[PDB]
Amino acid sequence: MGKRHRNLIDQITTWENLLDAYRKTSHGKRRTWGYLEFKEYDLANLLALQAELKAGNYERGPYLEFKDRLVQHALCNIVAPIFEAGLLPYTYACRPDKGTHAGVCHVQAELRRTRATHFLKSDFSKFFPSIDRAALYAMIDKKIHCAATRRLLRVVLPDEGVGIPIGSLTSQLFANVYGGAVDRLLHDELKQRHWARYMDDIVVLGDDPEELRAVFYRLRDFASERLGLKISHWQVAPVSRGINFLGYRIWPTHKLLRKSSVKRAKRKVANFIKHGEDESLQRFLASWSGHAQWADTHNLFTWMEEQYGIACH
Amino acid sequence: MEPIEEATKCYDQMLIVERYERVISYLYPIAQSIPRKHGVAREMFLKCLLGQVELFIVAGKSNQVSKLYAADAGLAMLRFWLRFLAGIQKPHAMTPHQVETAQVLIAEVGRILGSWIARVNR
Amino acid sequence: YDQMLIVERYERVISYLYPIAQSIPRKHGVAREMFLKCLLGQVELFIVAGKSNQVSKLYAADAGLAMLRFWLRFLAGIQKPHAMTPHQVETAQVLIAEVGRILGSWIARVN
Amino acid sequence: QMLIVERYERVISYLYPIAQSIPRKHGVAREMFLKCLLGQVELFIVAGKSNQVSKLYAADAGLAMLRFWLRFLAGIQKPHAMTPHQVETAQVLIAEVGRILGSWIARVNR
Amino acid sequence: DQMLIVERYERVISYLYPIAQSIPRKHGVAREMFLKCLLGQVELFIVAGKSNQVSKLYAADAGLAMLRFWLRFLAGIQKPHAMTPHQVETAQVLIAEVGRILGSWIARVN
Amino acid sequence: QMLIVERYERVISYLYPIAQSIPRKHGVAREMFLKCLLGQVELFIVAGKSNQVSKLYAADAGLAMLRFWLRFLAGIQKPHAMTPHQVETAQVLIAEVGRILGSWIARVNR
RNA sequence: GGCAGGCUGGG
RNA sequence: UGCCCAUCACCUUCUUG
RNA sequence: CAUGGCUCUGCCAACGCUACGGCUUGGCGGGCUGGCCUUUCCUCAAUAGGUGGUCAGCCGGUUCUGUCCUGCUUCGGCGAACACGUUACACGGUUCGGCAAAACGUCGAUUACUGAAAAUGGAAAGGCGGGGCCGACUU
């Protein structure tokens, strides 16, 4: 909005927000030690959080706590819409009114509207464990401009390391940003007008399967040197193999679910929980967090963190 | 910030109460609709409904198993009140969808109380 | 100290909540009567705890403070005339938290 | 023995309609009767979560107190006597719960 | 035995309950609390009889004392005269009768 | 006991009129104050019979609650019902019954 | 996702 | 995936008196 | 319900009780619990979205379970494990244009500019998008 966004810590710590954040943080997490210990004195908790954030004395506890997820939700209520507006239409991950489904539809559509002939489908590396958390904060910082939101973003996600912590509302929006770079190297540069990124995977329908392969090389070279994410699950398939984007392989004709893996994992986790084996689950989780770091499984990673409260790290 | 701590932070009491708050949030609207008459039944139901929280919490904060059983007794009495407000209350009080709904919520609180009774019993 | 301090800090809860609890419509008059009995009767819970220096009676004092916070939560959703508006539960919760703090310190001092 | 509650719940189902009826005039007596009637369920419930003879006698007392309430509500005067039938036709119900309570007391005692 | 005390206390209630219903609204809490002490002392006698601990017979005595207190209290409670001093006397006679039985019962247990 | 109650009767006799002056609005606070005031007599009485020191400290808690109620009615009850003077005079009377309760506590924990 | 064991039917 | 049932927030007009 | 309230009155009666004043209790008004206590309805019913399970139609329903598993390739492919034609094989408007001005986005830019300093000021021009726009047809 006129760029700038130079006073977000005022809106992040509005009660009206630290409550929205509260209600969003407690959504589903209302059977957790964190909500239940917070809820006790919870608009007094939110009054000492509001006034931690409004002071610049918010200090994230270790990996999240309820307040930490609430601070994240209170950031990502004011930060999110000022990044998620610079997220080209065709990024289908963790945004509002543009969910998973809308992408399995955009992709299909953009394979129909301009029927296309061929397509690329990449899938960045451990997007979150690979995010510079550094050239991320050169995008979380060409848009924040509020030097306190910026310092709250940098508590909520430190401006070092190489690893956006998987499953943080912050990450989500952030990786849909340190990913949007590649969306803005597809759609802006590269003039790829038909694509769809849901975090890591950037389907890129073409017509010269040789052009998509170019696009992909250009995308990988970019996202590896600017963004530090090493694409690997890439293909340049003709539109016929089906674009395994967002769990639905979406060829112009219908789009059938993929899963099996998700479902297997979902079940594996659920079983582990109701087996008292929540310590080998960390091993399994670490494993599946490797098989899925490549895939756009972030909203899925948030989803699984929301369902079982499982810090995979 | 570190959320305002209560002492004897008991997860089970916090959870049970929060979950039981959903029983109250369901039943209190349909306690407060039992007409003018059946006001004593209502007041007694409301004292059972809203007063079970104290049983849990006194159960939660004073980790003596005596109080949990007496919170189970209270949950049991609350189940009676549903039974009662459904059946024996005569205009209506609680539609059988509501006992079905309420019994689920009290059942959820029943589950948590049971787990809590068990974890203390060990 | 201890009991005297806790009660003077809790008196601020009562001074805040009693007006709220007197405003609760008669319709919500069990809730109200039970809230008032929890509010004004936590003073008894505090009083008993200081009469005894028995950590159980200050956990019963904690239980009452917890019930009082339940009451704040409850009267806020209390369907109609939600006794404690969001603001009144922020204010009250802060006061009860202050009483909570003192109770916690007192529980610890006894521990 | 939780047929106790389910046999008592017909005492309540009989007595509540007419305890409701106990006019405002006799309102403490009603409130106290209703607290005795509907609160014996709690007395029974507590007895069945404990199976300690003390709580079983408390259930008996409440049936005993409930029996008192019938006799009291009898001579409450005016139109609003729990009519002798109802005392009788509730004393039958309370007696049925009394029998089961007695058997339960005995089962625990021996 | 609980049955005797309660039947003699029923006379207190039958005397005091009418008087305790005349205790003015202006003295309504006192009234409702007196009524709850009066009917409700029946419970304390019954509970004392439906078991034996002698501690529950003392609680029956405490309740009568609260009841005797209530008589003395309500007699000369204010300008809205609740209980006439005679009624405290008449009631005190009846409460004394149940007092005697409670005393004998406490003794027989002791 | 007997003397504590007769001295506490003076508290009630002072505070009940003060408690009956509390306006309608603060009627539940009033009801609750009166139940603390008139019902502490029960706390004293029950200790009088059942001498276990457990029962005597509950009497103290009630007086402390009664003392709280004075504080509450003087100030927190918003038309500060009890005037500070009334609080002063009441606290003197409560203090007298406090003294007797203290002596009684001491006599029991010899 | 599927196979199997249940469970709930089949006419 | 379309036909729908669990089920979660809503959107109500409904009168819960 | 904005709860069989009211320590709440007026009236009128009479269970009763009276300290003979009353009170009580019942009518019977009225006042009273937030605009005027409408709203806020709490119910319930009910429209449209999500989440899981299922019908691609009398054998399935429904999870609890136990397990199992996520590739391959001949470079074309194939597979994704009977929701089985993994898709009632046909669209949701994932529709068609016409646009892309604006708003939106993004970049230009936290640049120009202002001001010692951009300091929680601050653009734009422009460029790039479609996310936006206008019809058609359908929804």
Phi, psi of B57 (to 5 degrees): -65, -55
Q: Provide the token pair at F108.
A: 């029991």
- State the Cα angle at F4 between E110 and F9, rounded to 5°: 120
CA distance C30 to C75: 11
Instruction: Concatenate the DSSP letters of all residues of F79-108 into one string.
Output: S-SS-HHHHHHHHHHHHHHHHHHHHHHHHH
CB-strand contact A246/H, under 7 Å:
no
Query: Is residue A109 located within the same domain as residue A218?
Result: yes
- Answer positive or negative: Cα dihedral of A209, A213, A216, A218: negative
Of F39, F45, F50, the CB nearest to E55: F50
Total domain count for chain A? 3
Task: Tell me the shortest Cα–Cα distance from C97 to chain B, in angstroms.
Answer: 6
Angle in degrees, CA D16, D22, D23, rounded to 5: 140
Burial group, residue A90, by CB count within 10 angstroms (0-12, 13-18, 19+): buried
Looking at the domain assignment, is residue B4 inside a domain? Answer: no
Structure tokens at A47: 């009054």
**C34 close to F (CB below 8 A):** no
Q: Say which CATH number the domain at C40 has.
A: 1.20.1440.60
CB of F45 within 8 Å of a chain E CB? The answer is yes
Query: Which chain B positions have a beta carbon within 8 Å of D12's beta carbon?
Result: 84, 88
Sequence-separated (6 or more) residues with CB below 8 Å from residue A165? A63, A128, A157, A171, A313
Name the closest residue on chain B to residue A55, using Cα atoms.
B1
The Cα F61–Cα C44 span in angstroms is 6
State whether residue D66 is helix, strand or coil.
helix
Q: How far is C56 from chain B (nearest CA, A)?
A: 6
**Cβ pair D29:E49 closer than 8 A:** no
d(CA A15, CA A18): 5
Q: How far apart are CA B15 and CA A301, in angstroms?
A: 25
The residues pairing with A244 across neighbouring beta strands, listed in sequence order, are A249
Burial class (CB in 10 A: 0-12, 13-18, 19+), C84: buried
Q: Is A124 one of the annotated binding-site residues?
A: yes
Q: Looking at the domain assignment, is residue B2 inside a domain?
A: no
The Cα-based distances of A167 to A129, A299, A311 in angstroms read: 11, 8, 8
A123 is in an annotated binding site: yes
Closest CA to A168 of A43, A252, A64: A64
Give, in degrees to the nearest 5, the angle at Cα D98 between D94 and D101. 135
Using CA of residue C13, residue C16, residue C22, residue C25, what is the dihedral sign? negative
What 8-state DSSP symbol labels residue D62? H
Number of domains in chain F: 1
Amino acid identity of E18?
P
Token duo for residue D106: 């005995």
Q: Using alpha carbons, list the distances in angstroms from residue A259 to A238, A256, A305, B69, B106.
A: 22, 10, 18, 45, 36
Residue identified by tokens 């409004």 is: A54
Q: Is residue A129, in this structure, part of any structural domain at all? A: no
| Closest alpha carbon to A87 in A3, A182, A163 | A182
Task: State the nucleotide closest to A259 in CA–C1' terms.
Answer: G1
Q: Can you tell me whether residue A121 is helix, strand or coil?
A: strand
Q: Is residue A140 part of a domain?
A: no
- In angstroms, the CA D38 to CA D19 distance is 10
Distance CA B64, CA C105 (A): 21
CB E46 within 8 A of CB E40: no
> Is F65–C47 a contact, with Cβ atoms under 8 angstroms apart?
yes
H/E run at residue A119: strand A118-121
Which residue of chain D has the CA closest to E35? D28
With residues binned 3-state (H G I as helix, E B as strand, rest as coil), the percentages for chain D, rounded to 5, are: 85, 0, 15
Three-state DSSP state, A148: coil
Let me know how long chain A is: 313
* Rounded distance between C-alpha atoms, residue A77 and residue B18, angstroms: 26
- How many Å apart are CA A95 and CA A72, to the nearest integer? 15
Q: Check CB contact under 8 Å for A43 and C93.
A: yes
Closest by CA to C37, choosing from B43, F28, B49, is F28
Q: C-chain residues within 8 Å CB-CB of F60?
A: 51
A238 - beta bridge partners?
Answer: A118
CA distances from A146 to A9, A12, A48, A79, A84 (A): 7, 11, 21, 10, 17
Find where tokens 């819970």 sit. Answer: C45
For chains A and B, CB pairs below 8 A equal 39
What's the CA angle centered on B39, arms B37 and B45, to 5 degrees? 135
Q: Is the Cβ of B70 closer than 8 Å to some Cβ of chain C?
A: no
In contact, A189 and A99? CB cutoff 8 Å: no
C-alpha–C-alpha distance, residues A43 and C88, integer Å: 10
Torsion of CA A247, A250, A255, A256, to 10 degrees: -40
Which burial class, exposed, middle or buried, applies to F109 when counting CB atoms under 10 A from its CB (0-12, 13-18, 19+)? exposed
Nearest beta carbon to residue B3 from set A31, A38, A58: A38
A163-CA/I73-C1' distance, Å: 36
CB F29 within 8 A of CB C14: no
The answer, for F77 touching chain C at a CB cutoff of 8 Å, is yes
Q: What is the CATH number of the domain that holds A204?
A: 3.30.70
Alpha-helical (H) ranges within E23-54 are: 28-38, 41-49
Could you give the CA distance from residue B71 to residue E61 in angstroms, rounded to a whole number?
30
Contact yes or no for A41 and C69 at CB 8 A = yes
Contact yes or no for D102/D6 (Cβ under 8 A): no
Provide CB contacts within 8 A for B118, sequence distance 6+: none
Sign of the CA dihedral running A66, A29, A259, A91: negative
Q: CA-CA distance, A259 to D8, in Å (whole number)? A: 55
Protein CA at C68 to nucleotide C1' at I47, angstroms: 40
Provide CB contacts within 8 A for A313, sequence distance 6+: A63, A165, A166, A286, A289
Beta bridge partners of A91: A197
Q: Which of A265, A287, A279, A64 is nearest to A164 (CA)?
A: A64
Tokens of E92: 């005190």
Nearest chain E alpha carbon to D54: E51
CA D80 to C1' I28 (Å) is: 21
Task: Mark yes or no for CB contact B89/D30 under 8 Å.
Answer: no
As a whole number of Å, the end-to-end CA separation of chain B is 35
Tokens representing residue F61 in the block: 């808690």
How far: F41 CA to I115 C1' (Å)? 78
Structure tokens at E43: 């419970």
Closest to E56 in 3D by CA, of E43, E66, E68, E67? E43
Instruction: Count CB neighbours of A61 within 10 A.
Output: 12
Q: Which residue of B has its CA nearest to C105?
A: B7
Which residue type occupies E59? A
Which positions ≥6 away from B27 have C-beta within 8 Å?
Answer: B45, B49, B78, B82, B94, B98, B102, B105
* Host domain of residue A274: 261-308
* Nucleotides in H strand less than 7 A from protein CB: 1, 16-17
Is A159 annotated in some ligand binding site? no
User: Is any atom of strand H within 7 angstroms of residue B35's beta carbon?
Assistant: yes
F101 is in which domain, residue-wise? 3-108
DSSP-based three-state secondary structure for A244: strand
Beta-bridge partners for A237: A119
Nearest to A60 by CA among A156, A184, A128: A156
Q: What is the 3-state secondary structure (H, E, C) of chain B?
A: CCCCCCCCCCHHHHHHHHHHHHHHHHHHHHHCCCCCCCHHHHHHHHHHHHHHHHHHHHHHHCCCHHHHHHHHHHHHHHHHHHHHHHHHCCCCCCCHHHHHHHHHHHHHHHHHHHHHHHHHHC
Length of chain C: 111
Nearest residue of D to residue E25, measured between CA atoms: D25
State how far the Cα of A56 lies from the Cα of B26, in Å rounded to an integer: 40
Query: Using a CB-CB distance cutoff of 8 angstroms, which residues of chain E are in contact with residue D57?
Result: 50-51
Residues in chain F: 110
Question: Is the CB of residue D59 less than 8 Å from the CB of residue D4?
Answer: yes
Angle at E46 between CA E41 and CA E52, to 5 degrees: 120
Closest CA to B27 of B45, B52, B43, B39: B45
What does the alpha-carbon distance between residue B110 and residue E41 come to, in Å, rounded to a whole number? 35
Spell D76-97 as b/e; 16+ CB within 10 A means b: beeebbbeeebbeebbebbeeb
The nucleotide lying nearest A263 (C-alpha to C1') is G1
Experimental method: cryo-EM
Question: Which nucleotide shows the minimum CA-to-C1' distance to residue A255?
Answer: I87
Shared-domain flag, residues A57 and A72: yes
Please give the structure tokens belonging to residue E57: 């017979």
Q: Helix E41-49 to helix E2-22 angle, to the nearest 10 degrees?
A: 170
Q: Tell me the two tokens of residue F41.
A: 């007599």
Other CB atoms closer than 10 Å to residue A81's CB: what's the count? 14
Nearest residue to nucleotide I70, by CA–C1' distance, is: A261
Residue type, A162: V
Q: Are B83 and B48 in contact (CB under 8 A)?
A: no
Give the three-class secondary structure for C55: helix
Residue in the block written with tokens 């601070």: A71
For A70, residues 6+ apart whose C-beta sits below 8 A from its C-beta are: A18, A21, A22, A25, A38, A46, A49
Cα dihedral sign, A74-A78-A81-A84: negative
Residues of B 79-108 whose CB lies less than 7 Å from any atom of strand H: 91-92
Q: Would the annotation count A141 as a binding residue?
A: no
